Amino acid sequence: MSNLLLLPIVIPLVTAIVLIFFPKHVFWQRVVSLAATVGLVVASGALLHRVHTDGIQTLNVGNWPAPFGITLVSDSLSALLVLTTSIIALACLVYSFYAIGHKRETFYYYSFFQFLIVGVNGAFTTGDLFNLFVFFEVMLMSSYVLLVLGGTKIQLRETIKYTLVNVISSALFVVAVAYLYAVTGTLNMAHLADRINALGSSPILTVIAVLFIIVFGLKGAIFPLYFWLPGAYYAPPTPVLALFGGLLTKVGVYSILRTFTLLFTHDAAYTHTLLAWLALGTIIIGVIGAVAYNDMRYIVIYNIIAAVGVMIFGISIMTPESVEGTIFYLLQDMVMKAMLFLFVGIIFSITRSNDIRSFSGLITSYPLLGWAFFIAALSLAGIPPLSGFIGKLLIVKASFDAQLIFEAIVILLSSLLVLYSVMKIFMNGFWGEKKGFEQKQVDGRLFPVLFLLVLSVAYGIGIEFVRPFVLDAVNVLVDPSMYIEAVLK
Amino acid sequence: PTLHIAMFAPFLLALLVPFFYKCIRSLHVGWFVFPLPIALFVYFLSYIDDVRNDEVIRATMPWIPSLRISFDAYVDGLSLLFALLITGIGSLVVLYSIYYLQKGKEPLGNFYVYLLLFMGAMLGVVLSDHLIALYMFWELTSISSFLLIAYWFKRDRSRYGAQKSMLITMFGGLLMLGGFVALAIAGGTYNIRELVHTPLTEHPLFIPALVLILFGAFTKSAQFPFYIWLPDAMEAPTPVSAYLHSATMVKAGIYVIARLTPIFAVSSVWVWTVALVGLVTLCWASFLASKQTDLKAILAYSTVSQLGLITSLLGIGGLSFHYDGMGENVFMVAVLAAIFHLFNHATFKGSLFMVVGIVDHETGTRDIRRLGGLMTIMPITFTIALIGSLSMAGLPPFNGFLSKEMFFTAMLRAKDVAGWAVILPVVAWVASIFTFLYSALLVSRTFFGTYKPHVLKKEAHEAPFGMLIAPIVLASLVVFIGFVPNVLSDSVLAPAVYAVLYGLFAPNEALDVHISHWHGFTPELFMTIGVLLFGLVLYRTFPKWKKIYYRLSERMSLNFFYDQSFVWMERGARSFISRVMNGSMRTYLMYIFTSLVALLLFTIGWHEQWHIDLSRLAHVRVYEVVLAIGILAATVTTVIAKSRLTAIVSLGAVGYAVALFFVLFRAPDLALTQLVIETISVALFLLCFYHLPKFTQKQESVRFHLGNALVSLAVGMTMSIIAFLAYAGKHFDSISQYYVDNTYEKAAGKNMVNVILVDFRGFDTLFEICVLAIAALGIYAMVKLRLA
Numbered sequence A: 001m002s003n004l005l006l007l008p009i010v011i012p013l014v015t016a017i018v019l020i021f022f023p024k025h026v027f028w029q030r031v032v033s034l035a036a037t038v039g040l041v042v043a044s045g046a047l048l049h050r051v052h053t054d055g056i057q058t059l060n061v062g063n064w065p066a067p068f069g070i071t072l073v074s075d076s077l078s079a080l081l082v083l084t085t086s087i088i089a090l091a092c093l094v095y096s097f098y099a100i101g102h103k104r105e106t107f108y109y110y111s112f113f114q115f116l117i118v119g120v121n122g123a124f125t126t127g128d129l130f131n132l133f134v135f136f137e138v139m140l141m142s143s144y145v146l147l148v149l150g151g152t153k154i155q156l157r158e159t160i161k162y163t164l165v166n167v168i169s170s171a172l173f174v175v176a177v178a179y180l181y182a183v184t185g186t187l188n189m190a191h192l193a194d195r196i197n198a199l200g201s202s203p204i205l206t207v208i209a210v211l212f213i214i215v216f217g218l219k220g221a222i223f224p225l226y227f228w229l230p231g232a233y234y235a236p237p238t239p240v241l242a243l244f245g246g247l248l249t250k251v252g253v254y255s256i257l258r259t260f261t262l263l264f265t266h267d268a269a270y271t272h273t274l275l276a277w278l279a280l281g282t283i284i285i286g287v288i289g290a291v292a293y294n295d296m297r298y299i300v301i302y303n304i305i306a307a308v309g310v311m312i313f314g315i316s317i318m319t320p321e322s323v324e325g326t327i328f329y330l331l332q333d334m335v336m337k338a339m340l341f342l343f344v345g346i347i348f349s350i351t352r353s354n355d356i357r358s359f360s361g362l363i364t365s366y367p368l369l370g371w372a373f374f375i376a377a378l379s380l381a382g383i384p385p386l387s388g389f390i391g392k393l394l395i396v397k398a399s400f401d402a403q404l405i406f407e408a409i410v411i412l413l414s415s416l417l418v419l420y421s422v423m424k425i426f427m428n429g430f431w432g433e434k435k436g437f438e439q440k441q442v443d444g445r446l447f448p449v450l451f452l453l454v455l456s457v458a459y460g461i462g463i464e465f466v467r468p469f470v471l472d473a474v475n476v477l478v479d480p481s482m483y484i485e486a487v488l489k
Numbered sequence B: 001p002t003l004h005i006a007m008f009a010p011f012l013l014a015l016l017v018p019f020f021y022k023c024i025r026s027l028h029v030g031w032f033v034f035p036l037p038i039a040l041f042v043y044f045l046s047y048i049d050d051v052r053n054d055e056v057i058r059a060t061m062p063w064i065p066s067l068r069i070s071f072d073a074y075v076d077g078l079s080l081l082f083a084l085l086i087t088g089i090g091s092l093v094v095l096y097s098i099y100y101l102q103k104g105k106e107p108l109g110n111f112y113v114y115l116l117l118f119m120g121a122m123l124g125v126v127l128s129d130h131l132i133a134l135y136m137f138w139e140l141t142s143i144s145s146f147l148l149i150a151y152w153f154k155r156d157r158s159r160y161g162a163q164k165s166m167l168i169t170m171f172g173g174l175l176m177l178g179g180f181v182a183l184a185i186a187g188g189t190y191n192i193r194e195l196v197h198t199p200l201t202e203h204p205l206f207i208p209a210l211v212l213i214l215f216g217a218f219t220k221s222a223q224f225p226f227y228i229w230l231p232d233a234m235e236a237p238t239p240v241s242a243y244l245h246s247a248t249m250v251k252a253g254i255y256v257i258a259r260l261t262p263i264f265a266v267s268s269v270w271v272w273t274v275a276l277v278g279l280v281t282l283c284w285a286s287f288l289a290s291k292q293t294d295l296k297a298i299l300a301y302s303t304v305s306q307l308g309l310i311t312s313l314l315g316i317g318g319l320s321f322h323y324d325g326m327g328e329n330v331f332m333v334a335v336l337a338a339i340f341h342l343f344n345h346a347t348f349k350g351s352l353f354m355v356v357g358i359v360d361h362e363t364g365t366r367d368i369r370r371l372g373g374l375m376t377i378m379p380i381t382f383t384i385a386l387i388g389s390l391s392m393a394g395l396p397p398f399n400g401f402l403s404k405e406m407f408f409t410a411m412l413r414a415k416d417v418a419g420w421a422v423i424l425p426v427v428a429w430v431a432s433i434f435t436f437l438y439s440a441l442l443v444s445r446t447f448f449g450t451y452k453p454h455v456l457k458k459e460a461h462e463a464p465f466g467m468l469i470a471p472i473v474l475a476s477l478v479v480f481i482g483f484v485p486n487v488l489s490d491s492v493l494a495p496a497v498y499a500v501l502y503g504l505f506a507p508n509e510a511l512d513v514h515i516s517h518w519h520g521f522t523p524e525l526f527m528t529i530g531v532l533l534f535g536l537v538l539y540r541t542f543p544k545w546k547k548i549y550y551r552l553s554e555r556m557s558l559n560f561f562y563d564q565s566f567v568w569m570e571r572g573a574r575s576f577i578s579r580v581m582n583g584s585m586r587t588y589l590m591y592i593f594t595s596l597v598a599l600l601l602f603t604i605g606w607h608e609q610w611h612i613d614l615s616r617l618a619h620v621r622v623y624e625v626v627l628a629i630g631i632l633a634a635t636v637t638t639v640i641a642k643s644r645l646t647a648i649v650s651l652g653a654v655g656y657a658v659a660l661f662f663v664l665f666r667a668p669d670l671a672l673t674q675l676v677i678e679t680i681s682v683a684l685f686l687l688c689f690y691h692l693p694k695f696t697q698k699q700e701s702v703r704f705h706l707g708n709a710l711v712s713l714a715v716g717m718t719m720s721i722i723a724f725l726a727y728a729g730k731h732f733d734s735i736s737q738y739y740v741d742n743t744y745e746k747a748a749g750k751n752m753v754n755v756i757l758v759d760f761r762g763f764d765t766l767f768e769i770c771v772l773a774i775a776a777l778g779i780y781a782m783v784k785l786r787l788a
């Protein structure tokens, strides 16, 4: 009944637990994880229809009232993020069936997979700050182990780096929760939002909001807090990397979004001009890194950084059109970055090399993969029949309506430069004569990538279907009074 | 509505092409592509009766109705002119490509898929009434043209040309999108025909929309300085060159300028920007077109020059909107001139490309210095080339007479509003001189001279008739609008002028009696005679001023600047990431810590930080003082320790004394768990110590760097002062009266830390159990799995 909201959290959790008992039986690992992920997708779709039909769904964990126990809240944005997470998880799991070798999946691989999706799905639906802390460490601990699993020298080194950074940011989130508890005295989102709005003219709230910016920008890579991410994402294997690029940096973006649309609304001018300048720096760093490299993984990594910057710039304007555009761009960018890492993995499987300058002439031997990557590149850029057009269109329109000409031109030129990076991959890798590779039949793993591509194309065609969910999400984001009268009954 | 299945029919047939291509192996696939443009052309002949008697055709297909986006379609005179051009020259280029390409040596299904995507995209560009739909069709045009230029992907220069054309036209298209969005905010709506009936100059977003739309429209139609991509798009197949770079894509910016002229030509920035950049690229391409040594580069710079002519006439036709002195109304003539030469250019330019394509695969070369006497070898294509070149030069019996005399008539009557504009026609005049030169040189170094029986290929150079069909039809249409200019004017060209100059015709008889005007002694006649005589006396002496012309053409170009600009951009970005991304973790920690300190201290210093209330503070007691002195001693001996065991045992002492604080601040559970966890963790540190490698170990002290010490003191004092500011301000109390009031009355417990951990907030204890489980499984996986 009303526990439907926990079915994105409970279903992978149970699954991860029962995958501990039989490590050496890889067939039943695959069967149980596949069936549970399909059930996760079905339950998340049912939750999205539930939050669409009647109102926002709130569940107290015990029978305890709203300030005093843990409350889980699913609005329409969190349900959309859960469904997007479920689709990405299913595609990455089937790619994991074809891609991960035998030895790495005898040692608890699918358990760690399910714990990572537990962490992200719990992070998108929570109503407490410290519970959100705990879900961040579930997510981060599973990401540490998935990064290090296999134990070659490269992933040892960058697991040390990645672990060091996330320990520092975890301690910083602890001290931020401590400061905010000393000011307010509560721990759930809605009641401390009410308490912050009861004393909104104090400077310490601005200082703690800037501290949350620093923490969540260490989580999802903002300038000047991005520096850990290139080597850390250059380390892991391909489906693990698709999980990381699809999911990990985008929960920091959602946390920034929830923080500045729910908690900190008084004295908005300083916080929003800070977000604007950090977002502009993030976009510039991302497009410079995308132009600079002749290496596929680095190109997709800096495209992650650039798209995060565009989303943060959409957050930095308190207009419903900009919020609508960054929600559209958020969903399609999660799906698209997971898709592009799976493409890069297939191309590396063919070429036995990651250098763009080493190989050419893949259209003459792999036409479906080539034209799929062509459509994926043009959908990443923002060409209008494809997915990522209406998001940046609404962002550009909301920036022109608020008199930001230069920043809108920065967004459009960033779209140009990210198109140049991915089309550099396409034109130097797929076109040309044949010199770099040897004919090797790919199998199986192409189909989850094609499934993601078909869903992205159908997303770009069918904006009118997927829009009223985003409209209810915008109606709850730009008005937190409905959020705090839904929880605090 | 029957036009919805006309706009989206080339896309469906582009879906169906490879089916017919690999399932019908006998018949050439282009024949199956052949009827559809024919059908569209015949369908587009069905609207002329409704457009002559000033009636328009409107259609709507909604796409996102809540974001207020549709595929609108609006059909009037200008859109019919462009649609008839697209479909007629499309069917002719399809026929020429049937007879040009081969069957068992060429991928043909790719060719006709790309071409038919381009045709559907261009028909969508022209017919569109919605701005976002227009931008969508614009982008599809750019992508399909990018595909068509690189048709031979196994050769380098095609990929260079496709990359450069892609980057330039995408840059223009994105700034075009920004201008469209600014215009749609300036007006209330998105549809073009409702932006006309509303005022837009009293709005701040009018000039940025003007500059961005104008920037994209100059980028598409190869204006100055953006003409750079069009001479390198000549590595395409010859039907691609003919169709795209004669009639369809290079006129899209022309269509946008002519379409939005009733909105933006009320300002002077639009009309003078358009006119001046048209004159500049006319003269610049007319100068540069005589340097080249192959046919297609000459025709590419020719295309750039006549596009500049058309857009300069569009600028003077924008000057028509302000005022006309006492019913003179002369500037409207410029509009007609533009539209006439627009239509005119398409026809002969298409034929000329087809001509050079023929002679290419009838000789093997296309350079000007190997092919000589081809008059009595190839008479029919010589006739077609002579007709096209004399029409391009601007000579009396062919089309170029009316085009050039209306051009000089429009330019001479436009200098009578400002004195500096007296500079403008004579500059344009020498452009025509330059024009004649290359056109004369074209024919006079293609077919004249003598035959070379040693380098050439074939004893018989007789061309097939099927290749020759479409240039004959284009040359016949050239001759027909030459000798009979009245019927095509009164049928097509007049409602185009009534479209471009909307809301301005209070009478309509002056335009009609100027269309019916053909002869009468004009002062522009001896101007054309002087063009002819000076081009004749300039061409005969051309091997004398040849070196001066070659070195002055070397003296200024624009591909040098673009190539070095991209080398600069990639090298600067690469040196940026080689500077700031060093790889050392110490440096990135310095950047993160410094940014943390800077943002927090600036946020504190920006405010005034009032209301320091020391009344919350508790009374200090001696035991906490002595224990604080103890853990300060352990902290100081763990930062200044020479060996690492000393830092390990000092971290242990810090842990046990934090446990003693937990005892002393009334926290028993914290003390128990803290003692056990610190004993286990210190055992793990001693595990990590004694397996250090014996080489390069050396047991050295902590190295002192001044920046690390400054950053560390700033971090500590920053979080200290934030803790003091937060703890001693205004506050709401807490929510723990409920937990001390309902631990036993509602739950079953007397302990309160444990009841919070398992009953009130027990939902997060489950996931810290999960964190410990992941940690143990990960330690097992790291130790046991050693695949390397």
Ligand SMILES: CCCCCCCCCCCCCCCCCCCC(=O)O[C@H](COC(=O)CCCCCCCCCCCCCC)COP(=O)(O)OCCN
Binding pocket: B627, B629, B630, B631, B633, B634, B637, B643, B645, B646, B648, B649, B650, B652, B653, B656, B657, B660, B682, B686
């Ligand atoms: C005071 C704590 C009160 C609570 C009681 C806690 C008791 C347990 C504390 C943690 C125990 C960890 C045990 C680890 C193994 C230690 C013995 C083996 C290692 C060893 O001898 O290392 C030497 C010890 O450090 C040295 O020789 C220098 C040691 C410096 C310790 C500094 C402690 C400051 C505390 C300040 C007051 C705090 C009061 C709190 C109530 C380093 O020397 P090496 O390199 O020569 O090794 C000799 C090579 N054969």
